[PDB]
Design an enzyme around this catalytic site. Structure first.
Site, PDB file in Angstrom:
ATOM      1  N   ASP A  19      -5.901  -2.408   7.739  1.00 58.15           N
ATOM      2  CA  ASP A  19      -5.459  -3.526   6.862  1.00 58.15           C
ATOM      3  C   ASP A  19      -4.478  -4.461   7.512  1.00 58.15           C
ATOM      4  O   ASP A  19      -3.270  -4.234   7.534  1.00 58.15           O
ATOM      5  CB  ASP A  19      -4.842  -2.887   5.608  1.00 58.15           C
ATOM      6  CG  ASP A  19      -4.642  -3.901   4.552  1.00 58.15           C
ATOM      7  OD1 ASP A  19      -4.901  -5.127   4.822  1.00 58.15           O
ATOM      8  OD2 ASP A  19      -4.203  -3.530   3.447  1.00 58.15           O
ATOM      9  N   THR A  20      -4.973  -5.569   8.045  1.00 59.17           N
ATOM     10  CA  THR A  20      -4.127  -6.545   8.671  1.00 59.17           C
ATOM     11  C   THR A  20      -3.198  -7.246   7.707  1.00 59.17           C
ATOM     12  O   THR A  20      -2.193  -7.818   8.111  1.00 59.17           O
ATOM     13  CB  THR A  20      -4.965  -7.610   9.401  1.00 59.17           C
ATOM     14  OG1 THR A  20      -5.844  -8.252   8.472  1.00 59.17           O
ATOM     15  CG2 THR A  20      -5.768  -6.968  10.514  1.00 59.17           C
ATOM     16  N   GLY A  21      -3.503  -7.174   6.427  1.00 55.62           N
ATOM     17  CA  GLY A  21      -2.682  -7.752   5.377  1.00 55.62           C
ATOM     18  C   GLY A  21      -1.640  -6.791   4.847  1.00 55.62           C
ATOM     19  O   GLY A  21      -0.944  -7.136   3.884  1.00 55.62           O
TER      20      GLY A  21
HETATM   21  C1  LIG Z   1      -4.459  -1.051  -1.614  1.00 61.82           C
HETATM   22  C2  LIG Z   1      -5.778  -1.808  -1.785  1.00 61.82           C
HETATM   23  C3  LIG Z   1      -6.401  -2.214  -0.503  1.00 61.82           C
HETATM   24  C4  LIG Z   1      -5.538  -3.049   0.401  1.00 61.82           C
HETATM   25  C5  LIG Z   1      -5.032  -4.356  -0.166  1.00 61.82           C
HETATM   26  C6  LIG Z   1      -4.205  -5.140   0.857  1.00 61.82           C
HETATM   27  N1  LIG Z   1      -3.709  -6.338   0.428  1.00 61.82           N
HETATM   28  C7  LIG Z   1      -2.406  -6.880   0.839  1.00 61.82           C
HETATM   29  C8  LIG Z   1      -2.116  -8.253   0.259  1.00 61.82           C
HETATM   30  C9  LIG Z   1      -0.718  -8.783   0.509  1.00 61.82           C
HETATM   31  C10 LIG Z   1      -0.420  -9.809  -0.564  1.00 61.82           C
HETATM   32  C11 LIG Z   1       0.016  -9.156  -1.869  1.00 61.82           C
HETATM   33  C12 LIG Z   1      -1.283  -5.949   0.469  1.00 61.82           C
HETATM   34  O1  LIG Z   1      -1.214  -5.394  -0.644  1.00 61.82           O
HETATM   35  N2  LIG Z   1      -0.342  -5.773   1.366  1.00 61.82           N
HETATM   36  C13 LIG Z   1       0.834  -4.935   1.065  1.00 61.82           C
HETATM   37  C14 LIG Z   1       0.569  -3.488   1.388  1.00 61.82           C
HETATM   38  C15 LIG Z   1       1.717  -2.549   1.259  1.00 61.82           C
HETATM   39  C16 LIG Z   1       2.618  -2.466   2.497  1.00 61.82           C
HETATM   40  N3  LIG Z   1       3.903  -2.261   2.318  1.00 61.82           N
HETATM   41  O2  LIG Z   1       2.128  -2.622   3.583  1.00 61.82           O
HETATM   42  C17 LIG Z   1       2.020  -5.539   1.814  1.00 61.82           C
HETATM   43  O3  LIG Z   1       1.978  -5.850   3.014  1.00 61.82           O
HETATM   44  N4  LIG Z   1       3.132  -5.554   1.130  1.00 61.82           N
HETATM   45  C18 LIG Z   1       4.356  -6.077   1.701  1.00 61.82           C
HETATM   46  C19 LIG Z   1       4.744  -7.354   0.974  1.00 61.82           C
HETATM   47  C20 LIG Z   1       3.826  -8.552   1.104  1.00 61.82           C
HETATM   48  C21 LIG Z   1       4.608  -9.753   0.547  1.00 61.82           C
HETATM   49  N5  LIG Z   1       4.290 -10.977   1.263  1.00 61.82           N
HETATM   50  C22 LIG Z   1       4.780 -12.136   0.795  1.00 61.82           C
HETATM   51  N6  LIG Z   1       5.545 -12.178  -0.290  1.00 61.82           N
HETATM   52  N7  LIG Z   1       4.492 -13.243   1.440  1.00 61.82           N
HETATM   53  C23 LIG Z   1       5.447  -5.053   1.510  1.00 61.82           C
HETATM   54  N8  LIG Z   1       6.451  -4.863   2.701  1.00 61.82           N
HETATM   55  O4  LIG Z   1       5.562  -4.430   0.474  1.00 61.82           O
HETATM   56  N9  LIG Z   1      -6.173  -5.112  -0.705  1.00 61.82           N
HETATM   57  C24 LIG Z   1      -6.133  -5.633  -1.905  1.00 61.82           C
HETATM   58  O5  LIG Z   1      -5.074  -5.615  -2.570  1.00 61.82           O
HETATM   59  C25 LIG Z   1      -7.386  -6.252  -2.452  1.00 61.82           C
HETATM   60  N10 LIG Z   1      -8.142  -5.195  -3.096  1.00 61.82           N
HETATM   61  C26 LIG Z   1      -9.358  -4.867  -2.720  1.00 61.82           C
HETATM   62  O6  LIG Z   1      -9.906  -5.408  -1.769  1.00 61.82           O
HETATM   63  C27 LIG Z   1     -10.065  -3.747  -3.506  1.00 61.82           C
HETATM   64  N11 LIG Z   1      -9.278  -3.064  -4.486  1.00 61.82           N
HETATM   65  C28 LIG Z   1      -8.970  -1.777  -4.323  1.00 61.82           C
HETATM   66  C29 LIG Z   1      -8.135  -1.128  -5.389  1.00 61.82           C
HETATM   67  O7  LIG Z   1      -9.398  -1.127  -3.348  1.00 61.82           O
HETATM   68  C30 LIG Z   1     -11.284  -4.387  -4.183  1.00 61.82           C
HETATM   69  C31 LIG Z   1     -12.185  -3.318  -4.828  1.00 61.82           C
HETATM   70  O8  LIG Z   1     -10.811  -5.315  -5.192  1.00 61.82           O
HETATM   71  C32 LIG Z   1      -7.098  -7.445  -3.395  1.00 61.82           C
HETATM   72  C33 LIG Z   1      -6.392  -8.587  -2.674  1.00 61.82           C
HETATM   73  C34 LIG Z   1      -8.318  -7.935  -4.159  1.00 61.82           C
HETATM   74  C35 LIG Z   1      -9.463  -8.460  -3.327  1.00 61.82           C
END
Ligand SMILES: CCCC[C@@H](CN[C@@H](CCCC)C(=O)N[C@@H](CCC(N)=O)C(=O)N[C@@H](CCCNC(N)=[NH2+])C(N)=O)NC(=O)[C@@H](NC(=O)[C@@H](NC(C)=O)[C@@H](C)O)[C@@H](C)CC
Lengths: 99, 99
Positions: B25-27
């Site tokens: 997960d690059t995101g």
């Molecule tokens: C857990 C589910 C799979 C991974 C997740 C990664 N997405 C990123 C998006 C970032 C924007 C919100 C994420 O949550 N990243 C978090 C992951 C947790 C982590 N700590 O690494 C992140 O980096 N969070 C940072 C904060 C980002 C804030 N950035 C900002 N404010 N600019 C953090 N340190 O908490 N994918 C998703 O959330 C996507 N979900 C999905 O693709 C699937 N859903 C599920 C439940 O699998 C599909 C069936 O819908 C969403 C976008 C819908 C298409």
């Protein structure tokens, strides 16, 4: 380009005539953009991830320019905290993960 | 390898001697895994995603294999919907995004 992952992989996009910043997210099935207007019919969708679900509007056949590369596909619009380019458009620009 | 994005980029990981599936997960800034037992002390962390925030346990210097590549680093444990390998470990295995 080759994008390293030391920092968040943010790029400029152009969608609906507007420039925005967005995250290239291999962990996202779909592309999700903050509230904006788009043309055409839509249908509601719920999408989930960390923290649960949000309700979005699904628009089809939307063109986006992503870091200079054009792609067409479905775009979801709603209260996402971050604009996200997901796999549905990453494939179209030829993006791969390499290691 | 070169991983295309037509399907979810799921790989096998090994942590605590056990094989699990996780999403590259690059995101994701961080690596977050579903409830399991890890050794040592943990510290509190709040993380956010598309639906809001959750509390997780932070474990440092955990030995983990990702698609056969060895890494040692921070693993967050909590109520993530799916196991995700984020940038903190993607950088250790030399992953890049390319298009
Ligand atoms: C857990 C589910 C799979 C991974 C997740 C990664 N997405 C990123 C998006 C970032 C924007 C919100 C994420 O949550 N990243 C978090 C992951 C947790 C982590 N700590 O690494 C992140 O980096 N969070 C940072 C904060 C980002 C804030 N950035 C900002 N404010 N600019 C953090 N340190 O908490 N994918 C998703 O959330 C996507 N979900 C999905 O693709 C699937 N859903 C599920 C439940 O699998 C599909 C069936 O819908 C969403 C976008 C819908 C298409």
């Amino acid at each position: 380009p080759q994008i390293t992952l030391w920092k968040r992989p943010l790029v400029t996009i152009k969608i609906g005539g507007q420039l925005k910043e967005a995250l290239l997210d291999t962990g996202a099935d779909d592309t999700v953009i903050e509230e904006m207007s788009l043309p055409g019919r839509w249908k509601p969708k719920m999408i989930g991830g960390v923290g649960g679900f949000i309700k979005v509007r699904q628009y089809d056949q939307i063109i986006i320019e992503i870091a200079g590369h054009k792609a067409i596909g479905t775009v979801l619009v709603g209260p996402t905290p971050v604009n996200i380019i997901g796999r549905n458009l990453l494939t179209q620009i030829g993006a791969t993960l390499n290691f």
